Symmetry: none
Subunit: 47 residues, 2 copies
């Protein structure tokens, strides 16, 4: 099971999925990240 929640410390609006995926993978050590239609970065994690 996996869970999608807001990034903890991503800065500013989320315009690029790459910026969010980078944050989620490399700062939070989670599975992946994407921007959603809210222009925020959401990370997926094992849950």
């Amino acid at each position: 099971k996996t869970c999608e929640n807001l990034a903890d410390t991503f800065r500013g609006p989320c315009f690029t999925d790459g910026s969010c995926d980078d944050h989620c993978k490399n700062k939070e050590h989670l599975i992946k990240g994407r921007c959603r239609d809210d222009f925020r970065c959401w990370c997926t994690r094992n849950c």
Copy 2:
């Protein structure tokens, strides 16, 4: 498992997928690469 993450020491913006694929395969000895919407080079590797 495969993993996609940022290239190591790909210089400059990623505006052409083939330049990234080349880097990832030939400089980093990974599977493949592509530019993403962050204009960075992302490599896929066995992990």
